[PDB]
Amino acid sequence: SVVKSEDYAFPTYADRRDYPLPDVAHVTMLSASQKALKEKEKADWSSLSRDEKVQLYRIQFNESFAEMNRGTNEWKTVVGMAMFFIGFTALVLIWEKSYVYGPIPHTFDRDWVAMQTKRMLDMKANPIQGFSAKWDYDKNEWKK
Amino acid sequence: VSAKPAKTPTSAVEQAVGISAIVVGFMVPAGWVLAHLESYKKS
Amino acid sequence: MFINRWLFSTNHKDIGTLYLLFGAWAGMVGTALSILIRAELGQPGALLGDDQIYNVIVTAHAFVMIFFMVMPMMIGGFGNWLVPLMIGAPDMAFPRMNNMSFWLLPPSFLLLLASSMVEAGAGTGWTVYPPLAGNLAHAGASVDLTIFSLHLAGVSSILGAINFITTIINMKPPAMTQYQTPLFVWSVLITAVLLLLSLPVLAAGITMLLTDRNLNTTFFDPAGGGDPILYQHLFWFFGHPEVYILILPGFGIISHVVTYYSGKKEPFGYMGMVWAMMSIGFLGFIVWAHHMFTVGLDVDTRAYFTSATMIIAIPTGVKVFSWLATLHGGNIKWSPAMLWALGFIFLFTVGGLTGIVLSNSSLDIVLHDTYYVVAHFHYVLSMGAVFAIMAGFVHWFPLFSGFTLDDTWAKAHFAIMFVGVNMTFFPQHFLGLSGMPRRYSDYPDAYTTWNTVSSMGSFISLTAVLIMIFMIWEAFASKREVMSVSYASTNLEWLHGCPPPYHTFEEPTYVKVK
Amino acid sequence: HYEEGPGKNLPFSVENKWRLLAMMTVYFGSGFAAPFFIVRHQLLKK
Amino acid sequence: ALLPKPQMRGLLAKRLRVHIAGAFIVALGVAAAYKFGVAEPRKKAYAEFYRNYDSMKDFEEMRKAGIFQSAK
Amino acid sequence: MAYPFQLGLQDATSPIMEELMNFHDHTLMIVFLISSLVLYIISLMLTTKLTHTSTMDAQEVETIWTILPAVILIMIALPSLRILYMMDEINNPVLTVKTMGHQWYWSYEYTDYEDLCFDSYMIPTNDLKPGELRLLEVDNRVVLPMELPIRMLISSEDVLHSWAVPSLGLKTDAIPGRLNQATVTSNRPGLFYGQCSEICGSNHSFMPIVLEMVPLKYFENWSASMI
Amino acid sequence: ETDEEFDARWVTYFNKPDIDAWELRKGMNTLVGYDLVPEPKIIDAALRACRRLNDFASAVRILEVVKDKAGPHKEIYPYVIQELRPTLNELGISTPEELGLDKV
Amino acid sequence: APSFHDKYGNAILAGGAIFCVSTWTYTATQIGIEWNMSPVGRVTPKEWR
Amino acid sequence: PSISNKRIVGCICEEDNCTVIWFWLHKGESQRCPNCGTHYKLVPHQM
């Protein structure tokens, strides 16, 4: 049952379109019906039907090139468990916001934000394009 | 690299308790330290 | 028996496995340190009180994951695991010295941890700029332990570099010349050359700093004739060669990953790649004053150094163009190592190009010591060399251990890591352009929002590293061995089997007669 | 002679999955939890 | 009926030729998009700001409230 | 002087740093062009169906591959040196101001004539006047005039500070034993903010620099009535 | 280079009578790496070489490596099979669309 | 053979997508943190001395 | 020559080449480098 330890040293089967004809057959040991199949291979070809053709292809090499490169759907599961784990990270953010952090500084209050925004607009903080360029100084309201 | 199948199988439930054990073992000392720093500041 | 294998080791594979273990340990240490640093910049506050301990944490982050994650894992682990296996050598030329370098690493880690342990703390940044690191602003035993940690890491890196150079040049088959080795061997050739031609300046500068702190000299005290810009010159003369140490075996790993899974028997423009890498290793020594465009240099010096910075910019572009042209019409198979490689190419490209934006001295006048710099190098290091090392580890983990990682779990790890590190390091461009300086525990309100966004992105990356342990546990939860390896003819390291035995190349390789 | 094979070129025990999970989680958790203990000790010291 | 001979030598080369032409025109389009969006709008903002500008009236407009420490 | 969701640079007052913005926009063109180019190539040639794994020719594309990045970097570097050699011209210093970076605070010296120096501390958060800012307020502001080339001569006592204002495009490292000369020109009056850009210990995040620039008649009425 | 001497040396290589499956195997493996869907005379030579030592399976793999090299456009293989058709009814070989190898 | 992906891809898109959008609008809106939103447009500035 | 019945054989089979074609060679009949055509026969009589 156990193959000898020089399995890497022996020529091994491989299925890819870069290397479409591998050096070794897929099924190395042949059964007696497959021995009769091989001597029927030695005979003429035009007297041989479709079902032993497809079983001949399946016992010589592993699978056909049209369906080995089909679209397997693992990217769906990958992105699904991805956003599942961004969700678990969000739960970590819930816990770490509830327990670890203390209060925000008092400058984040709405009245303090209003007075400091009035200060920014009063001293013309970067008033060309950055912040005070959206505030009209005539109508005293934001630009619309 | 083509891989042989698993000599020991792994079902869903032991994977689930393994990832749960890993996350709780990683987060219980870190969350133990970060859960309370008022005691470490001697406040 | 256990001590005679894992403590008294004299073969490169076991020693390299021990670098994988120690580098993974230091990677989780620095990951936790980064979790703290992003942990109180999510909400503006003195969560740790004084920011002296914050600078201690930042310095610990920088030191442990520069000298204790990336250099051990990359240089030691991948060199000791791959360089004898690619070139056909049975072992290294000096195995006991390699073992001494490896076993010198954990005392350096211990002294760095003890440097963080002392109540003054070595909170002085990755650069050790005196006399903030002197005996008046940091009056304690901590930064002396930091200096001795750097001594031990530098001596270990120098011994490893000596062994690497002599085992590439001398331990090679006879009719194989220097231009038939794989490109990772060239990467560690120029890398070990730059280690051995950079680390003596660092060792001399930190010996000078130790003598300034303790033996009352005045190399860096201007009150006795010194100059701190001498330390800046010496430190960055070491440092940018050390920067290209941190990036060049990443280039070698990325080149092997890109030419492997694409089906290419030969990477495109091998002589061009080799010329570009020697050009980087030759131009790395004349560029260092780009770190000192705000110190007060002469304007002709600054013009020369930005010109030489564009001259070091061109061969990196040659390398990235040769990568995109060795992808040329290949049978691409979407292993996760290609996902790491594409992430490397795009994000290292944008980080390096923001470096080119920072290269011009006139703009570097206003964009110095801001988070634009942090975004540039955190792109390049923190995900270029990082995705190169996960590409290498995920690729060679069947070779290293024997079992395989799950492809779905590894691609999910790539997705969670990609989203996390991009969310962490994208908005700090706008933070640095707005004018937020580095090494700040607390910021004004206007820099809040991007900070908060980046901080929670760091938590996403935290989830990523959890999956790392899980999927490697999944390998040892499955014991699924390999059938075989594709493209085994053009790579010698895969050809002794997964994993290779203790004594490989008992009878060495046979070379073509010609 | 030394022992070579899958899992036998590692210092840690491989054959039991659950003790491997326990030892890897305590090893990586100790590595993760070391700087937290360092920063809490400098918080306690000052 | 009968099918003619199709293109059969080096179609990936023709694909990369028409696509590097497309890459060049989309790089120029991205650069011109950033141009027309930001760059001369910024210089136009500077030009519209500075030509109808004086320091004295702007100074008086700031110092009505009393933000400055050098005027009371 | 920052504002929330700011993506670009701090808006212009000095001509030197608005020319820096023009060069910054030009190199932003360059990085957008080549990043979109490598993005299009990456999203393109990973999305093909054909294969070609032959021993292809090598030495037939290197002439463009060598000269074209050199051409892009030389059109990058021509405005670089063009504006680099314009911040160091023949100075006409109407005013000289020294600063010296004390242990987590600053000092400013106006002693061209009638010696004047002061030490600038920080307003604490719990001592804030309503409407002011956090981590960006100083009791004793730095007063400069407009339309004039003014020099800053910087130094420090022990640790390496850095006098930095990004809105005016000035950043020079305060080093002991070495005073550095940095020119400044302003075209608008106002209050322009900056912070320390070199680490200086256990309060490194807690020194701001504020530049109040006013006309000159208030300089006689201010410096004549300060000491 | 030119294509006439290329195709001439390839049809010289395949049509020799001392071929074996390993030799034609490595020849097809080094022929598939070109940026080129191979002309039907090459496919005649490869099919006769595959016929000379009694293999169905490699011949069907030749037909489907003509298939997947066509890319998105599928006007190649109808012309290819109308140029291959005399060998198809004198050899008894089967196209991959007819014995059930195109389907998943 | 029916693999994991052939229906569980749609299953984990549905579950992970709705779970991620639910917990992220919960952590973006329902907590009560201060995002330091831009005061442009809609908020009013109030006079300070 | 060999001492075992298995050896590394590298083929730099055309002059001034990047890649050496590495393959195991076993006792018995001589098989070639898998892309060029240089034969290789192992003789295990060298101690």
Ligand code: HEA
């Ligand atoms: C591996 C890490 C790494 C790498 C590769 C680089 C690469 C580069 N770095 Fe950087 N750098 C750091 C790590 C790195 N750096 C660190 C860690 C610091 C700060 C240390 C501290 O904190 O004090 C730093 C700091 C730093 C500064 C100082 C900023 C400051 O502190 O004020 C500067 C400015 O000159 C700079 C420049 C560059 C340049 C110009 C490159 C270039 O080599 C990048 C080239 C890369 C490319 C990918 C080129 C893109 C080209 C193409 C895509 C082809 C097309 C091109 C054309 C058509 C022209 N680096």
Ligand code: HEA
């Ligand atoms: C190796 C270099 C490196 C790396 C990877 C990182 C990674 C990160 N860095 Fe770091 N950083 C620096 C080097 C690095 N940094 C330096 C040199 C400084 C300046 C120091 C100074 O001030 O002088 C700095 C500064 C720095 C600051 C400055 C603090 C301040 O200005 O106030 C911040 C905060 O935003 C930060 C954040 C991060 C984050 C969030 C990551 C994240 O990318 C972290 C996530 C990374 C991982 C999770 C790695 C993966 C690890 C594993 C998978 C485990 C290993 C196991 C295997 C590989 C099998 N860094």
Ligand code: CUA
């Ligand atoms: Cu002064 Cu930092």
Ligand SMILES: [Cu+2]
């Ligand atoms: Cu540098």
Ligand SMILES: [Mg+2]
């Ligand atoms: Mg600086």
Ligand code: NA
């Ligand atoms: Na904080």
Ligand SMILES: [Zn+2]
């Ligand atoms: Zn050969």
